[PDB]
Amino acid sequence: VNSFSGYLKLTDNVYIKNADIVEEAKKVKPTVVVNAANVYLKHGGGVAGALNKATNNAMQVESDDYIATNGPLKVGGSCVLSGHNLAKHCLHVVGPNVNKGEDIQLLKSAYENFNQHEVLLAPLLSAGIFGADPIHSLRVCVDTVRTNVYLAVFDKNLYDKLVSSFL
């Protein structure tokens, strides 16, 4: 039993809700919140901009130190950093950005990072400003993640379409 509330159950391990991931993280304080990161951990917009704003820019300060030490992530890769006031940890995961021409096949590799964590609150990778089809992202999530994932979908219209079209 966990503290996530109001989710629709899609499969044995995947759950979905129309919610603002920022507000959901603040309420649940999950062990792991996933960020829709880029390789530079520049949290300017989309989910990343919203999460970083909610940390009062502390996420960005920590991220800049991480990059100065380690260099950029790989597309499809991840790193674990602090969750600040939102979660114990933040798993920064880089899905391919279609608006940059990146290989959509890397979306499966991106979701594989979730399997290193027993339970996660997450957005759909590569959705939103990353330009991929969210219906496809949900399919890859369900077919790749084996740990327990609670997906927050900000847009109500998109949420209803994801549910109604789910096979």
Ligand X SMILES: C[C@]1(Nc2ncnc3[nH]c4cc(F)ccc4c23)C[C@@H](O)C1
Q: Return residues touching Cl ion (CB under 5 A).
A: 46, 128-129
- Check binding of 21 to ligand X (CB under 6 A): yes
**Out of 128, 144, 145, 162, which residue is the one contacting ligand X (CB under 6 A)?**
128
Q: Shortest Cβ distance from residue 2 to Cl ion (Å)?
A: 25
Letter for the amino acid at 163?
V
Residues 6+ apart with CB under 8 A from 53: 22
The three-class DSSP label of residue 128 is helix
Strand extents, DSSP E, the chain: 8-9, 14-18, 32-36, 78-82, 89-93, 119-122, 148-153
Residue 68: CB minimum distance to ligand X, A? 26
Q: Rule CB under 6 A: say whether 123 interacts with ligand X.
A: yes
Q: Which of 14, 50, 132, 142 binds ligand X (CB under 6 A)?
A: 50
Beta bridge partners of 99: none
Burial class (CB within 10 angstroms; exposed 0-12, middle 13-18, buried 19+) of 156? exposed
Q: Which residue has the closest beta carbon to ligand X?
A: 128
Q: What is the 3-state secondary structure (H, E, C) of 36-50?
A: ECCCCCCCCCHHHHH
- Here's the x/- map for ligand X, 74-113, by CB under 6 A: it reads as ----------------------------------------
C-beta of 21 vs 142, nearer to ligand X: 21
List residues near ligand X by CB under 6 A: 20-22, 46-47, 50, 123-124, 127-128, 152-155, 158
